[PDB]
Every structure is written in C-alpha cells, then in structure tokens.
Amino acid sequence: HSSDDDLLLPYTKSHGPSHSHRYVRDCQPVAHGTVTHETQAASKHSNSPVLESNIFISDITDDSGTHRWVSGHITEVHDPLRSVSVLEPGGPGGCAHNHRELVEVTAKTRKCLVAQNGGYFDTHTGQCLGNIISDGKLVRNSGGIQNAQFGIRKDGTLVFGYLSEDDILDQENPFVQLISGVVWLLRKGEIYINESIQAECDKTQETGNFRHFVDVISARTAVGHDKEGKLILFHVDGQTDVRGMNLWQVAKFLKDQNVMNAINLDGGGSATYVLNGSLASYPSDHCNPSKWRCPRAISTVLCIHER
Amino acid sequence: HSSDDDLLLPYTKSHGPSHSHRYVRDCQPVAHGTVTHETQAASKHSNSPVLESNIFISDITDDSGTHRWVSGHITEVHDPLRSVSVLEPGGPGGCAHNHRELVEVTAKTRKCLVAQNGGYFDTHTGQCLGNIISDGKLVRNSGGIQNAQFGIRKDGTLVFGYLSEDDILDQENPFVQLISGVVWLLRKGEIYINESIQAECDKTQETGNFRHFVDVISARTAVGHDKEGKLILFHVDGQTDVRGMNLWQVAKFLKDQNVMNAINLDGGGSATYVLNGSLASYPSDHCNPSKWRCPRAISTVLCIHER
Ligand SMILES: *[C@@H]1O[C@H](CO[C@@H]2O[C@@H](C)[C@@H](O)[C@@H](O)[C@@H]2O)[C@@H](O[C@@H]2O[C@H](CO)[C@@H](O[C@@H]3O[C@H](CO[C@H]4O[C@H](CO)[C@@H](O)[C@H](O)[C@@H]4O)[C@@H](O)[C@H](O[C@H]4O[C@H](CO)[C@@H](O)[C@H](O)[C@@H]4O)[C@@H]3O)[C@H](O)[C@H]2NC(C)=O)[C@H](O)[C@H]1NC(C)=O
Ligand SMILES: *[C@@H]1O[C@H](CO)[C@@H](O)[C@H](O)[C@H]1NC(C)=O
Ligand SMILES: *[C@@H]1O[C@H](CO)[C@@H](O)[C@H](O)[C@H]1NC(C)=O
Ligand SMILES: *[C@@H]1O[C@H](CO)[C@@H](O)[C@H](O)[C@H]1NC(C)=O
Fold first, then answer.
1. Phi (first) and psi of residue B83, to 5 degrees
2. Has the keyword Repeat been applied to this entry (chains A, B) (predicted)?
3. A71 annotated as ligand-binding
4. Contact present, A89 and A99 (Cβ < 8 Å)
5. Which of B303, B304, B298 is nearest to B267 (CA)?
6. DSSP-based three-state secondary structure for B104
7. Cβ–Cβ < 8 Å for A46, B284
8. What's the CA gap between B293 and B101, in Å, rounded?
9. What angle do helix axes B193-200 and B247-255 make, rounded to 10 degrees?
10. What separation in Å is there between the alpha carbon of A288 and the centre of ligand 2?
11. CA B276 to ligand 4 center in whole angstroms
12. Nearest Cα to A296, choosing from A255, A276, A261, A266?
C-alpha cells in the first residue's frame, strides 16, 4: 500500500535485547526494588460513555529552545476491561500468516470506535513481534524478550513494564490482552526513558542508534493509564527528523496529563488514528508512487469498541 | 459547541460588496470578454468509483522565504452531477431557522462519503449567506450579491464565477446545486485574486480587513474542477496568522494540481473535513472550556454521496 519510507527503527538487526528478565531486575534502579512492572486496577465507570476522544494542537519546546506545532489525539477509556482489545492484523490468525493490513480494515472487523496501530513488526517479512494476547487467546510468545509491555488481566488489572516469560503464561489471573512496545515512557508518574535504554538495549547492540530512536522527532503512539485507572491512548502525527515529537517530549506531555505509566508503541509511518473505521490522522508514508500520503499496512491493532 | 475563537471574516459589516453584476462585468479584463463566469461539462465516469480522496503534507514557501508544513485533503469527484449536493445545516429548512450544525451531523443525514464545510454565515445570528440551491430547491436568493459562485446545472454543466440574479433564476437549464464563497481563486488556470479583490470588495466595506483576509494564513477550503470535468474539493488545516495558507498559496497549490477554475469557501475555524461521517481533520477552534480542539457548528455543507 504505502512506500514504507518513514521508517523509525530502534534496532538495526534483531528486534529487542538479548539479555534476560533477571538482568533487567539487576540493572533496575534501587528505588523500585526487585519488581519490574506496575499494576493498577482498571476503572469500571459503567455509567459513562465508552470513551472520550480529544484533538490537541500544541506548541512543543525542546532543550534547544526550538518551538514546534504538533497535532494528535488523546483518548480516555472508562471501562478498559470490557472495551479494549488487541487485534491481529486483518482478523484472527493474521500473525500466523505474517499478514500486514491497514488499521481501518482491521478495525472494521470489530466495529472499533477508536483504533490505533499497535506493536512493532518486521517490515520485510511481515512477522509479528513481541508478546501478543488477543481476547484471551495467546497469539505469540516472544520467549521472554525484554521490551516494554502493556496488558490487561481477567480481573481488570492493568499491567505496564517488563514481564518474564512465566509472568505472561500465568493461569491464576490470566492476561486477556497483551502487547509489546519499545521504551517505558513513564513509571509511577516519572520519566523512565534512561532506565528503558539500559533494559531494552544490550551490550551487543549499538546504543547510539537506539538513543537516536529516542531523541529524534517523529510520529509517535503510546498507551498508558491515569490516577483514576482510565486507559490513555496517545497519538501524535509526525515524520522522522522533520515533524512530531521525541520520546522525552511524549513523556513530559503525558506526565502533564496525569499519566502515571505508559509505554511507547510503533511510530513513524506506522502511526495511525482511525475514528469509527475512518482514517482521521495524517500518515507520513508516501503512496506508491505518488507524493500523496498513505497509511501503512501494519500488524497488531489497539481497538476500543462497545462494551 | 466550539468557542468560535478562530474567526476569519472578510467583511466587517453586512456581507459582500454593494455594486452590481454590471459593474463587475465592466471592470473585468478584456481577455475574458463580457462573460463573467466559466463553464465545464461535468465528467460522467460511471465506471469509476464515486471519488478519490488524497492526503497531502506539503512544504509551503511565502514571499518572506519562510517554509511551513501544511496538511489537508484533495478530493476528486467522478460524477459530480449525481453525487454532489449542497446541504442546509441539519437538513432541509435549516437556513430558514438560522440553524448552525456540525458537518458530521449534517453529513449523516445523507450518508455522505466526504463532507466539507460550505458557505459563509453570520456567526452571531446563524443567518445563511450568499446564493443557495440545494438538490434543485432554491433556498436563498442573495439578490445579486457579487461573490464567487459555484453551481451545477440540470444538464451537468459546472459553473464557476460571478452570476447575476437573473443568471441563477434561469429556468431554461436550471441550477440544481448552487453555493457562494468569497474570492475567485483560479480562472482559466490562472490566478484571479487581484480581479476578485476588485469585484468582491468596494468602498462600503473595510478594504483593509478584506485584503488581510486574503493575505493572512489560516485554514482554508475551496472547490474547483479540472479539464476532465471532475470536481476538486480542497481543504487545508490552519489557524489564522499561525498555521495554514493564504489565498495566494491556495491558488498556486491548486494551479499546480491542474485545477482550471476554483473559488474559496469558508475557512478558519469553520474548515472541516468529514470522512464517512467521522471527523478526519484537526479543527482550529478551541473547545468550551478546555484547550482541546473542537469542530465548529457551521451552515451549508458540501456533500459527496452515493450516485
Ligand atoms: C496582483 O497584485 C499584486 C499586488 O497586490 C497587493 O499586494 C498583495 C501582496 C496583497 O496585499 C494585495 O491585497 C494587494 O492588493 C502584485 O504583486 C506584485 O507583483 C510584482 C510582479 O509584477 C512584484 O514585483 C517585484 O517587486 C519586488 C519588490 O517587492 C519587495 O519589496 C516591496 C517593497 O515595497 C515589498 O512590499 C514586497 O513585499 C517585497 O518584499 C521587486 O524587488 C522585484 O524586482 C526585482 O526582481 C526582479 C526579478 O527578481 C528584477 O527584474 C528587478 O529588476 C528587481 O531586481 C519585482 O519588481 C511585487 O513584489 C508584487 N507585490 C507584492 C506586494 O508582493 C501582482 O503582480 C499582481 N498580479 C498580476 C498578475 O498583475
Ligand atoms: C538521562 O541520561 C541522559 C544522559 O545519558 C541525561 O538526559 C540525564 O542524565 C538523564 N535524564 C533523565 C531525565 O533521567
Ligand atoms: C460508524 O460507521 C458506521 C458506518 O460508516 C455508522 O453507521 C455508525 O453510525 C458509526 N458509528 C457511530 C458511533 O457514529
Ligand atoms: C464509507 O462508508 C461506506 C458505507 O456506506 C463503506 O461502504 C465504505 O467502505 C466507507 N469508506 C471508507 C473510506 O470508510
């Protein structure tokens, strides 16, 4: 569909770090003890609408003193357990076929009110990446790859952070939704990017390219939660090294929206915001072969649907 | 609905100029003869889709040498006669009730594939402005107010330019759609703003405010056609004196898109692009009372619907 020309790649070769969850615990800062994740009971506002979606057009400043206009959406979800779903591309079984699909197409399979692009994927093979649990079904076990995680448990517990392979296979209170990103933006209402860089990039990888992935501006998406337990979906349009935000700016932006924990999902040309099946953002990838903009065929999708 | 705080008003009092169509004809350049409008047989591609919608994100330069990013939509219509409709706000009878309504609401009354804000209106009273013909019904006769016009005739003829009161009341080949804007951007593939300034503003209006309305950057919408007879719908997001384009920039942009004739419709906080009933642009008005952005309650709507 698109030319795939706005690539925002955190890893030059193999996705994710090579070291184990135990290593993440050992390098993690003393302030957090030995637990490498955060939990929050999801809100249960059964008397509210499913969601509230807001458009922002904001003036962002960076350490250079430079000002930039940015535009995007913040989406608040009032009953995450009953309305949030991780979808495979195109429908159930998509990841098994290395299928890539537009967000709007995947979104129409479940009548999503708001849908955004989800996790990372191989742009050459279409292979899905990270851990994936869709509507209680386990879709992909990364094998303990230490990337920022977001999941919902059967009892409504929201989960953010780093999870071991055994964490996601637990049957006592099983995950019903699970998706992986890259970089833990906020932990306990504080910026956590430096810690993420140490945990999600290892000695055998070039930390420079990864730090550049963190520092460069581009289109970005993120998911988090607030003090009330509502789920926060973040999206900002951009183009790598031209428009949008870097992760430091996203973290500060969300921190000033009372977001307590959030992880960064796929961005660049993948960032998409679909409103009721209709593309409602400006993607960065050029079309094949025009200079028009085209949304990218991506992998998993974050869907917010009727309860 | 919105705070209505991004106002882009061409006239300080009343609306339109006071001089007659005869006066406009006499000032027109000899290169165009004595006819003050352009015609084009609408395309009849019954074997094509209804429309094609494209997103642009373009680098615009102004006489200051400064570069700015702009984003919006170009929409091509393949059977304008059977798929394009001028709608009253909220539905038939709206203009008589000084009703204002969101584009998405008015658009859902006719299952519009693409809908944009249409003509100008009084922001205090809700009064509709200009000539208005909706689905063959005459809605409002301005009385010969000389503003840029766009209309479709019963036999498919697309009409752009300045029309006398008798022109629109003709029954030989009656207008089935008609709407009024402000400023004729392109005539015969050439920029026509200078001529429009002479025709659509006279001494009884604040000429300063009008020239500022032309020169300032803001959100803008426009409608035009190409040699193939397709209808071209233009929209660019912005905010008066901060983001977007001025009419000089809109005109050049369309001229480089093989547009042959085009007029400027309502802009600023009114500029809206609704895709299949879903808001698919970033409006400029702030919400009441948050700092989020809200679409504006407007008057007439340009609707592209099933054949
Ligand atoms: C349509 O009308 C245009 C004028 O309309 C008004 O201005 C606009 C911007 C609105 O405000 C509108 O509401 C007004 O009614 C008219 O624009 C003019 O077009 C001519 C071309 O024929 C341009 O000529 C060049 O002028 C510059 C000077 O401009 C600079 O300095 C002045 C200082 O007074 C500033 O006001 C301007 O903003 C600029 O900063 C000359 O430097 C230039 O000559 C030099 O360059 C050429 C080649 O590069 C050489 O050959 C020369 O020897 C010189 O080296 C041109 O003479 C003029 O700038 C422009 N005016 C404005 C304000 O932009 C337009 O031409 C009309 N269209 C038609 C088809 O007639
Ligand atoms: C993160 O580390 C970088 C230098 O490596 C620098 O911005 C600062 O020391 C740290 N900032 C935060 C917010 O942790
Ligand atoms: C979503 O789109 C469908 C078809 O485009 C429409 O019928 C439905 O009303 C929309 N949903 C909402 C909540 O407006
Ligand atoms: C628009 O809605 C119609 C339903 O009438 C649907 O058939 C079509 O696929 C939709 N197109 C887009 C781009 O959403």
1. -125, -15
2. yes
3. no
4. yes
5. B298
6. helix
7. no
8. 16
9. 130
10. 40
11. 6
12. A266
Task: Indicate the top mutation candidate among A276, A304, A307 to test ligand 3's pocket, ranked by most ligand atoms within 8 A of CB.
Answer: A276
Residue B237, helix vs strand vs coil = coil
Task: Tell me which residue range forms the domain holding A42.
Answer: 1-307
Specify the number of domains making up chain A. 1
Looking up tokens 């036999």 gives B155
Q: Which tokens is B17 given?
A: 């100029």
Contact A109, A120 (CB under 8 A): no
Q: Do B57 and A275 count as a contact with CB atoms less than 8 A apart?
A: no
Structure tokens that stand for B291 in this block: 């700092």
Approach to solving: X-ray
Torsion of CA B190, B195, B199, B202, to 10 degrees: 150
User: Quick one: how far is CA B115 from the chain centroid?
Assistant: 12
Specify the resolution in Å: 2.8
B130 is in an annotated binding site: no
Contact A276 B278 (CB under 8 A): yes
- Which residues have C-beta within 8 Å of that of residue B221, sequence separation ≥ 6? B116, B117, B233, B234, B235, B236, B264, B265, B266, B267, B270, B271
Q: Ligand 4, atom 13: nearest CA belongs to which residue? A: A278
Amino acid letter, A28: Q
B-contacting residues of A 56-115, CB under 8 Å? 56-57, 69, 71
The DSSP annotation for B146-190 comes to: ---EEEEETT-EEEEE---HHHHH--SS-EEEEEE-S-EEEETTE
Q: Is A61 in the pocket of ligand 2 (CB under 6 A)?
A: no
B293 at A interface, C-beta within 8 A: yes
Map residue A173 onto helix, strand or coil.
Answer: coil
- B199 in Cβ contact with B185 (< 8 Å): no
| Bond into A92 cis (ω within 30) | no
Cβ of A277 less than 6 Å from ligand 3? yes
